[PDB]
Amino acid sequence: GAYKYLEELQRKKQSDVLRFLQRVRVWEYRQKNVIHRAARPTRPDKARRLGYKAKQGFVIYRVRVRRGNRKRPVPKGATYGKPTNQGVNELKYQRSLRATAEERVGRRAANLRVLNSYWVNQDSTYKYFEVILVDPQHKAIRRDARYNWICDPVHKHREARGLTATGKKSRGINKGHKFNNTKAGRRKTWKRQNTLSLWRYRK
Amino acid sequence: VKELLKYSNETKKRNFLETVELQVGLKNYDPQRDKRFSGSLKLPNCPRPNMSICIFGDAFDVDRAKSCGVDAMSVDDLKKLNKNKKLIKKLSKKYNAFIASEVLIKQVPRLLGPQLSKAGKFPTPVSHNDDLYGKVTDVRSTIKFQLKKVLCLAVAVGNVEMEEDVLVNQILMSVNFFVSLLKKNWQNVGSLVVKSSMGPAFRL
Amino acid sequence: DRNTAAETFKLFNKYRPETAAEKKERLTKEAAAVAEGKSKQDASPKPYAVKYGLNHVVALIENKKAKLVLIANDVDPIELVVFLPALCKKMGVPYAIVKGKARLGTLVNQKTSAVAALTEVRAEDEAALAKLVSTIDANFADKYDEVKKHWGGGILGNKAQAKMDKRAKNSDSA
RNA sequence: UUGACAUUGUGAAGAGACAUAGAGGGUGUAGAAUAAGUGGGAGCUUCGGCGCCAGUGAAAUACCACUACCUUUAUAGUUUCUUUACUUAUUCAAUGAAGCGGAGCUGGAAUUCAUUUUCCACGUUCUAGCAUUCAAGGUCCCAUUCGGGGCUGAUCCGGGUU
RNA sequence: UCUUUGUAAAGUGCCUUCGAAGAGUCGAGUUGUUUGGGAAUGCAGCUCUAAGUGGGUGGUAAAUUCCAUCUAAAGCUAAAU
RNA sequence: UUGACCUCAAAUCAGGUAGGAGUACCCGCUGAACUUAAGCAUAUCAAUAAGCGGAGGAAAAGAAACCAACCGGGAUUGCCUUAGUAACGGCGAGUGAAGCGGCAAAAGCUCAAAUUUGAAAUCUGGUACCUUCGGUGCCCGAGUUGUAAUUUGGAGAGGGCA
Numbered sequence: 001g002a003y004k005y006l007e008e009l010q011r012k013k014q015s016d017v018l019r020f021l022q023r024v025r026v027w028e029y030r031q032k033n034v035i036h037r038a039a040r041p042t043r044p045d046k047a048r049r050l051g052y053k054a055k056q057g058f059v060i061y062r063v064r065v066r067r068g069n070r071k072r073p074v075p076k077g078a079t080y081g082k083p084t085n086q087g088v089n090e091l092k093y094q095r096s097l098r099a100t101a102e103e104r105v106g107r108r109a110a111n112l113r114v115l116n117s118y119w120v121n122q123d124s125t126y127k128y129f130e131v132i133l134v135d136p137q138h139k140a141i142r143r144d145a146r147y148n149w150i151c152d153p154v155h156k157h158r159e160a161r162g163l164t165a166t167g168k169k170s171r172g173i174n175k176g177h178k179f180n181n182t183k184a185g186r187r188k189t190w191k192r193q194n195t196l197s198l199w200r201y202r203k
Numbered sequence: 204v205k206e207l208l209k210y211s212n213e214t215k216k217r218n219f220l221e222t223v224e225l226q227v228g229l230k231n232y233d234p235q236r237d238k239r240f241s242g243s244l245k246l247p248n249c250p251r252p253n254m255s256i257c258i259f260g261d262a263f264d265v266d267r268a269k270s271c272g273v274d275a276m277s278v279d280d281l282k283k284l285n286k287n288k289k290l291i292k293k294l295s296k297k298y299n300a301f302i303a304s305e306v307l308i309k310q311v312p313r314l315l316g317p318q319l320s321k322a323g324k325f326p327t328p329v330s331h332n333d334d335l336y337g338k339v340t341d342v343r344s345t346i347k348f349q350l351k352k353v354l355c356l357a358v359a360v361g362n363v364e365m366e367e368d369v370l371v372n373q374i375l376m377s378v379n380f381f382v383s384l385l386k387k388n389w390q391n392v393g394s395l396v397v398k399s400s401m402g403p404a405f406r407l
Numbered sequence: 408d409r410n411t412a413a414e415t416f417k418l419f420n421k422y423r424p425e426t427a428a429e430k431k432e433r434l435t436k437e438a439a440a441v442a443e444g445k446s447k448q449d450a451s452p453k454p455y456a457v458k459y460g461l462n463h464v465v466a467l468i469e470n471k472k473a474k475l476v477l478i479a480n481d482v483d484p485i486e487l488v489v490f491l492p493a494l495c496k497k498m499g500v501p502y503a504i505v506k507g508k509a510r511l512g513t514l515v516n517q518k519t520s521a522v523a524a525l526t527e528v529r530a531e532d533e534a535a536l537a538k539l540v541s542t543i544d545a546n547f548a549d550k551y552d553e554v555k556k557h558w559g560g561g562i563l564g565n566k567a568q569a570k571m572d573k574r575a576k577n578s579d580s581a
Numbered sequence: 582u583u584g585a586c587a588u589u590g591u592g593a594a595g596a597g598a599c600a601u602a603g604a605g606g607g608u609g610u611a612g613a614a615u616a617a618g619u620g621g622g623a624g625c626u627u628c629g630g631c632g633c634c635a636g637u638g639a640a641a642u643a644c645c646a647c648u649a650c651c652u653u654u655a656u657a658g659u660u661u662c663u664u665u666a667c668u669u670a671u672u673c674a675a676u677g678a679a680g681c682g683g684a685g686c687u688g689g690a691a692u693u694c695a696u697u698u699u700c701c702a703c704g705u706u707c708u709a710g711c712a713u714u715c716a717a718g719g720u721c722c723c724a725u726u727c728g729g730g731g732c733u734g735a736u737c738c739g740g741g742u743u
Numbered sequence: 744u745c746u747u748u749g750u751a752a753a754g755u756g757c758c759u760u761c762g763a764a765g766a767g768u769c770g771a772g773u774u775g776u777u778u779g780g781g782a783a784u785g786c787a788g789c790u791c792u793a794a795g796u797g798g799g800u801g802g803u804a805a806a807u808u809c810c811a812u813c814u815a816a817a818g819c820u821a822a823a824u
Numbered sequence: 825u826u827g828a829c830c831u832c833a834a835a836u837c838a839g840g841u842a843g844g845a846g847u848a849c850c851c852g853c854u855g856a857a858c859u860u861a862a863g864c865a866u867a868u869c870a871a872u873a874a875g876c877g878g879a880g881g882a883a884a885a886g887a888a889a890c891c892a893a894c895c896g897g898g899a900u901u902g903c904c905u906u907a908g909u910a911a912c913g914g915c916g917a918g919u920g921a922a923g924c925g926g927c928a929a930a931a932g933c934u935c936a937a938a939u940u941u942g943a944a945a946u947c948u949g950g951u952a953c954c955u956u957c958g959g960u961g962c963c964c965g966a967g968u969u970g971u972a973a974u975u976u977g978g979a980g981a982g983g984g985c986a
Contacts, residue, residue: 001462005490049936092775092788111841124588160878161851175890316639353648355620400621460968466939509829566682
């Protein structure tokens with residue numbers, strides 16, 4: 001096929017062709033709404049390898065998230081406590097911007113379920129993503145057992161509980177000795193070792 | 204590969220129109236420094252002769268001025284001193300020994316210049332005169348490193364067939380590469396502009 | 408231009424893929440044939456339809472089997488199609504950039520097609536095929552390095568262009 | 582508040598050097614002779630001529646070359662400085678995005694050095710009135726019904742609201 | 744117990760050509776945070792930005808040379824809890 | 825002038841679907857301070873409480889970009905243990921894991937990237953019928969900017985042979 005060729009074009013992002021296309025598209029999205037419908041992917045190579053089958057029910061949205069640091073609330077900087085916890089400007093917000101994009105399109109189109117998302121663009125002020133939401137009640141998705149797992153109601157809002165490719169990243173989940181804050185989730189492995197486990201016949 | 208071009212071979216034999224002994228010259232290319240202890244300071248045996256004319260001013264002493272009447276070019280002594288300092292220049296390179304190291308301070312102003320004497324680099328004051336004379340009348344190369352980067356030497360003759368001249372350019376590549384200092388760069392064989400004396404230049 | 412595209416779409420009006428009714432007809436014919444003569448899909452004649460589909464056409468160009476390739480001047484994900492002139496130049500297959508992917512859709516009975524490819528041709532129009540190949544290679548494939556070195560774009564709007572013309576006329580000449 | 586990077590691209594000046602070869606430049610003694618150094622080397626061209634040799638100096642040549650040394654960039658881009666010239670990014674502002682840009686017409690300033698080389702205008706000023714019915718007129722149609730359509734009246738071109 | 748669904752499907756031996764395998768990602772600098780993780784455990788901002796006998800990891804940084812074990816940047820899955 | 829394509833829409837269009845409550849457990853974000861240090865600023869309380877978002881009968885994790893260095897082991901979870909150790913820390917107060925060993929349970933896999941190209945063979949919907957949680961036929965649509973079959977790193981694909 002030709003997705004190998006689109007893949008290798010999409011890897012070289014600062015050559016003159018892709019920086020031209022990136023500037024046309026960054027204007028093209030900076031003149032539309034914040035969350036708006038994408039009739040077709042702009043990266044079919046990247047979209048298809050995340051789970052896009054171009055048939056009915058798979059919808060593509062495109063989304064601008066603002067770009068920077070989470071300036072803390074609790075107004076006028078007066079954080080009312082120890083001077084340890086007194087930062088306002090340099091706090092940096094454990095969720096990715098890729099998670100805020102998916103979560104906002106999941107709050108808009110709520111009958112749908114989110115599969116993944118991919119980068120398309122970034123300027124200085126914004127990041128631009130496309131989200132690859134699936135419509136689960138549509139009968140093409142409910143059949144064909146590769147894609148009915150989104151129908152099971154334990155997968156409502158994969159994007160909110162951290163279940164996509166990036167939610168499973170931002171939660172720190174892998175195997176490894178380097179992942180011991182969380183390998184099986186952080187809070188379960190917190191409570192599993194601040195439990196004082198007792199027994200009937202006290203050892 | 205050195206087989207598509209000539210580089211020592213039969214391909215450049217009719218390019219030069221002089222029907223005299225015209226010799227091939229190989230230039231090694233690698234950036235070096237300006238100091239004098241760096242580079243490839245070695246002149247090995249060239250296996251096939253360069254086919255050059257050379258006469259030796261053997262100014263020898265008691266134990267060594269007897270093996271020059273069999274296989275040599277000229278027989279000299281240490282008494283003939285008032286010639287090689289003023290007028291005569293009929294020589295190509297000399298050959299001396301270690302037995303007389305006090306006559307070397309006399310023939311400096313005339314013979315050290317055009318490479319007719321020895322300073323420190325070429326095996327000219329070698330003592331053995333019964334076996335090293337089958338190696339110097341079969342004329343060797345000349346490995347002499349210059350100021351910034353060039354290495355001009357002589358391998359063989361272009362009119363010589365490619366049977367004798369097949370292990371001569373190959374043994375010479377293994378001298379300016381392995382005994383060399385660690386002050387050279389990567390790809391010590393980077394460029395080899397090889398032209399003999401008259402024709403075009405054939406490079407690797 | 409209009410003339411070479413006119414000849415090309417005459418040639419492609421001669422070569423269209425099989426529609427549903429013709430498929431039903433050949434299904435009835437081979438359903439008779441397999442039940443009676445037991446010809447393993449060999450009582451049907453050999454097709455000569457146009458090749459189309461982007462992975463299809465790219466694989467046919469890679470395997471050196473494409474005679475001619477039409478390319479659209481289109482879809483804004485142009486990463487789909489900017490590597491087709493370089494493939495057709497690298498693999499020697501002639502290539503033409505026809506205007507509008509909708510005519511490519513109408514000759515293939517789709518909405519759009521975005522590529523078109525001849526690999527087979529019947530013996531009626533070998534000469535017309537060679538003439539079209541000659542015309543397109545005069546237009547595209549021989550002119551590859553020239554257009555490869557030049558930068559398009561930079562055309563101004565006509566207001567600022569006319570202002571630049573007035574200024575460059577009145578600052579250099581009289 | 583200031584500096585650096587990103588959004589942030591593109592033309593026009595000024596110094597560093599490369600793709601790419603060439604004309605030429607580079608004068609302490611001696612030595613036919615301005616040898617920045619090296620290699621091959623006793624000969625080449627029909628001849629002449631030079632060259633080997635000779636002699637000289639730290640360096641011997643005719644002949645073909647490499648590194649270099651000072652200009653010349655003719656062809657294409659990379660850099661920091663000049664702020665200049667940019668609209669498409671960006672930012673502001675206004676309007677129920679109404680006349681913007683370019684060209685022509687009639688007048689007229691305008692003097693012609695051949696014929697226009699240019700530039701301005703290009704429907705309203707005593708008056709607390711009025712200004713609307715796709716516009717009257719002119720012109721071409723319908724198939725003459727009572728009516729309706731087209732162009733002009735109100736210049737074309739470009740679709741960038743300014 | 745009624746169909747025999749099928750000249751269909753699956754499975755394994757030998758030789759040859761092969762053998763595609765996820766990029767603003769991996770990673771690195773710095774900052775905030777967290778960890779038991781200590782020249783930096785993980786996440787996140789911004790800046791730079793890859794590779795293919797490549798890439799991660801082998802918990803004192805770095806250079807050089809081997810070895811070992813793995814395949815990321817896509818997705819499903821009851822029970823023990 | 826007719827007829828398509830892309831893109832964006834408008835309906836009390838046809839049919840769907842999400843909001844809320846509970847929230848004991850579970851998944852994430854956000855996030856303190858009293859308190860301990862015999863003061864207090866890092867630290868500790870605590871990666872906690874309050875707030876928020878989202879699920880289920882369990883959630884999550886899950887078939888290794890793992891642990892190891894052995895004679896190697898093999899998805900995940902949980903228990904006994906390693907271990908109050910290694911390490912961190914005004915090296916103060918305190919904070920604090922992992923690998924192996926034993927056991928319960930044990931279950932494995934699926935996509936993208938290969939033209940099927942002698943044949944989109946696939947699918948939503950509407951219709952008519954029925955052995956009407958669905959099946960068949962027909963008909964517009966999605967769809968080749970790619971829907972089916974074939975394979976997924978453990979293998980596998982294309983030819984050839986028995």
